[PDB]
Design an enzyme around this catalytic site. Structure first.
Site, mmCIF file in Angstrom:
data_model
loop_
_atom_site.group_PDB
_atom_site.id
_atom_site.type_symbol
_atom_site.label_atom_id
_atom_site.label_comp_id
_atom_site.label_asym_id
_atom_site.label_seq_id
_atom_site.Cartn_x
_atom_site.Cartn_y
_atom_site.Cartn_z
ATOM 1 N N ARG A 250 -33.824 -19.157 26.719
ATOM 2 C CA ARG A 250 -33.869 -17.710 26.907
ATOM 3 C C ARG A 250 -34.209 -16.995 25.608
ATOM 4 O O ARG A 250 -35.010 -16.053 25.597
ATOM 5 C CB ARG A 250 -32.535 -17.214 27.462
ATOM 6 C CG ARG A 250 -32.461 -15.714 27.644
ATOM 7 C CD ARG A 250 -33.287 -15.255 28.828
ATOM 8 N NE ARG A 250 -32.775 -14.015 29.399
ATOM 9 C CZ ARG A 250 -33.023 -12.807 28.914
ATOM 10 N NH1 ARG A 250 -33.789 -12.636 27.849
ATOM 11 N NH2 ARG A 250 -32.491 -11.746 29.511
ATOM 12 N N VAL A 251 -33.613 -17.428 24.502
ATOM 13 C CA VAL A 251 -34.013 -16.969 23.180
ATOM 14 C C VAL A 251 -34.500 -18.181 22.403
ATOM 15 O O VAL A 251 -34.469 -19.309 22.908
ATOM 16 C CB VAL A 251 -32.863 -16.253 22.449
ATOM 17 C CG1 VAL A 251 -32.437 -15.020 23.223
ATOM 18 C CG2 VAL A 251 -31.693 -17.194 22.256
#
Ligand code: ATP
Ligand code: ADP
Ligand code: MG
Ligand code: MG
Lengths: 496, 48, 469, 53
Positions: free
Chosen positions: A354-355
């Site tokens: 996600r990051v």
């Protein structure tokens, strides 16, 4: 007033009458007596009227009704700082490697609230795991909580150990909190870390499956307290102050099991799958302390690599979904790919980050966007790989190149690769330079190519590493140098 | 053609049986866990 | 006032004894001095006897002993309300946590425990709320001033849909917005939501400049998560009561429920079903009924609801389901198939999906899409083992249309450019209806399925197919 | 009286007896009455039948 007596010893909980002036999470002492030379501690947690229930961090058969207990006056904490590096320690901070007592000046309290919600910054610095597949497709940044989820014997611990081994000159302090693992497994892990010299920047917190139920429940919190000490203050590693830590909670499912038995022996109402209602709070308050602080609050970071073991590849269980909803991204290790020879069995279809995509070296993302796209094309064409040459409009070529990239992602254990080697190999694969290489001999080719870069042209590797942060990576100088190196290797060597 | 199609159908049916057996094992484990949790709740609320 | 003494400390539940004539009220707030000049603001929940009360810590309560004094404030938890709360980030107690200064005493403080609006105040007016997402705007349309929720598992895109909704609609509000991050994980929230809300400009004012943010994140003990939603609702009710429209995003209501369950377990209540509190329905009613839009002002709510494991029969989502005007269901099977706006069209409904409210053609198209997908779901077992060849010609066409529809619901998002290397795409509701009507009419039958994946309206699919040619 | 005629016919619609049973279960559990199946009180069948007869 700080002295009490045990009035009942039960299922890991002793009742400790008469212990006034105890705070809600003290570490009671149980001073030594006849037949027990060493003190064993406990956490006072249920501070009810005229009774202080305390869970025993150790074997509960050693204490007896009527035993005398002293209050240390402090919330449960673990020694932290420079002296923990190179030491295998009890979740209480006591050494278990036999190298002597731990030297320290401060104890950080475990079980604290995360650094904050203002006090964070988006990940920008990458964590180089050394695995081609992970570093290319599932980027991990410093301060990112990347779960490692898989079945039993799928290489999750191997992935974590390779990640720890690759952080040699990267200015990272690694912590390995093995929760519920066999003592033989932890001994093998520590021997592997000592073999490659990683222990000079590595802390090991060992909570063996034979150990108590109260242990394996404070073990990830002890490790996270050490990691938070690295984050907030930093330690002197390789002659420089580092504030970056990478922690691996090995087998958090066993941590959840240990907390479940702690709760159930405390007669707490079970929830889903007999786990207590606050097991999500357990793992959430454990993992939220892994953050990337902004420059106002230090700028340090604590990368987290929790490990989850599934049953029959059940992603949708209780604890795996809890940790997935807590962590940032997932690294899913298939058993089918593991048994098929793809030893870094990265399920590229469902493993995400996600990051950390922004926290990737621009060289790696520039050469890995095409790799991800063509792996997606290969997965799309996987269902169509059952026709006797009925599809050939570059679809056979796409399947061959996808198989080539899949074989390239196959990596041997205990051999992390530097970022320059990774991006050079990925550029060679993504610029139609391995298409003449047969499938079974790609990996050897990669190895040989890396040797050709290590011995013949170190300056190409240095030039690649120097401009890895440029907005556009293939600048004409590095483009020409890498093209010349690849062509020269293809010339002086065979097809492999 | 019928032989090949029925062989493929048999293989797919075996795969579906495997998936359904996994689902049934999950359901059975969840049912027994729910039963023992309900019994423990109904017993501990009246004894201790 | 009314100084009492701590008797017991079980988890975050503190049992404190008070004088007989000065017992705190049921929802009264009591402060433990805690030393160092900073208090711990527990909130009472029960009265047990001769001055004995039970309170929830709203904080760490990890280093405080029995016998400590407790000062009764005499009033429930009061949070600031008004224009001073715009552009600020708050706690469960209303204390700002950003770098800005504290809220001045002149700002009105309102209790977080207020009665929900009565029956005469309810506003039943409903109209289409365009969001730019094809599956949301077609199958489960949003209601302006209506309650909608986005259920989902763990790895499905709940936060991504919330972020895309904020990026699509918070630049044009004609009002204010409130974001309650109840168990939001603090990385995808204030680290990202607050950063992207300060980057979006509305006539030289950022979106964050007209947004209240209240964050009871996962790191917080159960009390903060248990009352932070009510704090955010109290802050939003001020703007609702004065006529301003409110865009309310509450992330993971299930975190509210789970905090309540943990507190109830520590409070000695008898559990119900899978370890949940006996008062689950009443707690859900207490939070959800304050969300409703009234005649004075409207709140357009968009909640996210976590589903434990993937069990939609869990008591918390089941209690949430009946409190909504629009329901969106996110399925793990769709997300694993890379259709990342993984909304299940058969499990997603909406109240305003009526030919009188949204339109005759919109209703017809949505119902035909759902019928085709239901036929596909019925024929899944046939296709799994026999294959496509055994179906009839009409059934084959229906299944092909259903697969194209499933792929066509996927849409690239502006906030999802890191995952999919495609620019964000905004599709109006009229274009969505026209594109799906064209897909159902027969156009696109010659187009392969892969050209419907991650596109906009039908013109984008046609352009991609012509480019491939 | 209704539309000029004495109506003695009624049609009652309990729109959620599942929610009624949930509310009664909450009442019983807060009263610490012994639970039955799915934490419902023992007299939850006696409840609805008493309503529906
Ligand atoms: N990349 C790799 N290349 C070769 N062998 C590998 C690789 N990764 C893992 N293995 C092998 O797989 C086996 C199991 O790996 P590992 O112990 O890391 O897995 P695990 O999921 O942690 O297992 P366990 O459930 O026992 O904890 C070991 O024999 C290890 O050497
Ligand atoms: N619209 C989308 N486009 C691409 N990927 C998405 C999209 N929505 C979700 N994802 C995937 O889902 C993950 C984010 O899930 P998230 O919504 O944060 O889970 P949760 O439901 O816990 O909030 C990302 O890693 C991303 O890969
Ligand atoms: Mg292992
Ligand atoms: Mg989320």
């Amino acid at each position: 007033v700080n002295v009490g007596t045990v009035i009942a010893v039960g299922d890991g909980v002793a009742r400790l009458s008469g212990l006034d002036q105890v705070v809600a999470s003290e570490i009671v002492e149980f001073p030594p007596k006849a037949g027990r030379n060493e003190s064993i501690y406990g956490i006072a947690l249920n501070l009810e009227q005229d009774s202080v229930a305390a869970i025993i961090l150790g074997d509960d058969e050693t204490i007896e009704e009527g035993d005398m207990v002293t209050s240390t006056g402090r919330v449960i904490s673990v020694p932290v700082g420079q002296g923990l590096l190179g030491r295998v320690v009890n979740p209480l901070g006591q050494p278990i490697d036999g190298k002597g007592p731990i030297v320290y000046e401060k104890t950080r309290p475990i079980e604290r609230i995360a650094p904050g919600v203002i006090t964070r910054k988006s990940v920008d610095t990458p964590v180089q795991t050394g695995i081609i597949a992970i570093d290319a497709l599932i980027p991990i940044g410093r301060g990112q909580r990347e779960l490692i989820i898989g079945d039993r014997q799928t290489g999750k611990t191997a992935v974590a150990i390779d990640t720890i081994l690759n952080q040699k000159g990267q200015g990272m302090v690694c912590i390995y909190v093995a929760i519920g693992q066999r003592r033989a497994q932890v001994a093998q892990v520590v021997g592997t870390l000592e073999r490659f010299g990683a222990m000079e920047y590595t802390i090991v917190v060992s909570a063996t499956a034979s150990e108590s139920a109260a242990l394996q429940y404070i073990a990830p919190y002890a490790g996270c307290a050490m990691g938070e000490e690295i984050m907030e203050n930093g330690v002197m590693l390789n002659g420089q102050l580092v504030k970056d830590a990478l922690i691996v909670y090995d087998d958090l499912s066993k941590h959840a099991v240990a907390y479940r038995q702690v709760s159930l022996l405390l007669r707490r109402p079970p929830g889903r799958e007999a786990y207590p209602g606050d097991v999500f709070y357990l793992h959430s308050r454990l993992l939220e302390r892994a953050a990337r602080l902004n420059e106002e609050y230090g700028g340090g970071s604590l990368t987290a690599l929790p490990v989850i073991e599934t049953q029959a590849n059940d992603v949708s269980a209780y604890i795996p979904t809890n940790v997935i909803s807590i962590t940032d991204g997932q690294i899913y290790l298939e058993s089918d790919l593991f048994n098929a020879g793809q030893r870094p069995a990265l399920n590229v279809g469902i493993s995400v980050s996600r990051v950390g995509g922004a926290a990737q070296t621009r060289a790696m993302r520039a050469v890995a966007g095409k790799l991800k796209g063509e792996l997606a094309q290969f997965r799309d064409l996987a269902a169509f790989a059952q026709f006797a040459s009925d599809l050939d409009a570059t679809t056979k070529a796409q399947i061959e190149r996808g198989q080539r990239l899949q074989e390239l992602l196959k990596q041997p254990q205990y051999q992390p690769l530097p970022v320059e080697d990774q991006v050079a190999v990925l550029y060679a694969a993504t610029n139609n330079y391995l298409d003449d290489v047969p499938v079974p001999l790609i990996t050897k080719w990669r190895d040989d190519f890396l040797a050709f870069l290590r011995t013949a042209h170190p300056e190409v590797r240095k030039l690649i590493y120097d401009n890895r942060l440029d907005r556009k990576f293939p600048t004409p100088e590095v483009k020409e140098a890498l093209e010349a190196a690849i062509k020269e290797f293809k010339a002086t060597s065979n097809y492999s | 053609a019928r032989m090949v199609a029925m062989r493929n159908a048999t293989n797919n049916a075996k795969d579906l049986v495997r998936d359904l057996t996994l689902s049934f094992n999950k359901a059975r484990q969840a049912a027994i866990t729910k039963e023992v949790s309900e019994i423990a709740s109904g017993a501990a609320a009246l004894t201790s | 006032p009314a100084k009492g003494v701590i008797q017991e400390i079980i988890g975050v539940v503190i049992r404190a004894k008070f004088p007989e004539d000065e017992v705190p009220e049921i929802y009264n707030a009591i402060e433990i001095p805690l030393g160092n000049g900073d208090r711990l603001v527990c909130e009472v929940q029960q009265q047990l006897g001769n001055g004995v009360v039970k309170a929830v810590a709203m904080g760490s309560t990890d280093g405080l002993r029995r016998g400590l004094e407790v000062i009764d404030t005499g009033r429930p938890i009061a949070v600031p309300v008004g224009p001073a709360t715009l552009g600020r980030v708050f706690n469960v107690l209303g204390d700002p946590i950003d770098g800005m200064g504290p809220i001045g005493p002149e700002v009105e403080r309102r209790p977080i425990h207020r009665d929900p609006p009565s029956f005469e105040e309810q506003n039943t007016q409903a109209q289409i709320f365009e969001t730019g997402i094809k599956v949301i705007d077609l199958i489960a349309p949003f209601t302006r001033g209506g309650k909608t929720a986005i259920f989902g598992g763990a790895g499905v895109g709940k936060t991504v849909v919330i972020q895309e909704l904020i990026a699509n609609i918070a630049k044009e509000q004609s009002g204010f917005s409130v974001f309650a991050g109840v168990g939001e994980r603090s990385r995808e929230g204030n680290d990202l939501i607050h950063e992207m809300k300060e980057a979006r400009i509305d006539e030289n004012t950022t979106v964050f400049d007209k947004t209240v943010m209240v964050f009871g994140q996962m790191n917080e003990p159960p009390g903060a998560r248990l009352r932070v939603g009510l704090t955010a609702l109290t802050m939003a009710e001020y703007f609702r009561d004065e006529g301003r429209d409110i865009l309310l995003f509450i992330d993971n209501i299930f975190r509210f429920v789970q905090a309540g369950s943990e507190v109830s377990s520590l409070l000695g209540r008898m559990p119900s079903q899978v370890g949940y509190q006996p008062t689950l329905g009443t707690e859900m009613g207490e939070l959800q009924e304050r969300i409703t839009s009234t005649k004075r002002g409207s709140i357009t709510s968009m909640q996210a609801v976590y589903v434990p494991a993937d069990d939609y029969t869990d008591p918390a989502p089941a209690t949430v389901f009946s409190h909504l005007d629009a329901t969106i269901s996110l399925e793990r099977s769709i997300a694993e198939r890379a259709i990342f706006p993984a909304v299940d069209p058969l499990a997603s409904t909406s109240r305003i999906l009526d030919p009188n409210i949204v339109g005759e053609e919109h209703y017809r198209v949505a119902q035909e899409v759902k019928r085709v997908l239901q036929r596909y779901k019925d024929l899944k077992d046939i296709i799994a083992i026999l294959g496509m060849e055994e179906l009839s010609d009409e059934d084959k066409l229906t299944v092909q249309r259903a697969r194209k529809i499933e792929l066509f619901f996927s849409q690239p998002f502006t906030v999802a450019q890191q995952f999919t290397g495609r620019p964000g795409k905004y599709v109006p509701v009229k274009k969505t209806v026209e594109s799906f009507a064209r897909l159902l009419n027969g156009e696109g039958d010659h187009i392969p399925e892969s050209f419907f994946y991650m596109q906009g309206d039908f013109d984008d699919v046609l352009a991609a197919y012509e480019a491939s040619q």
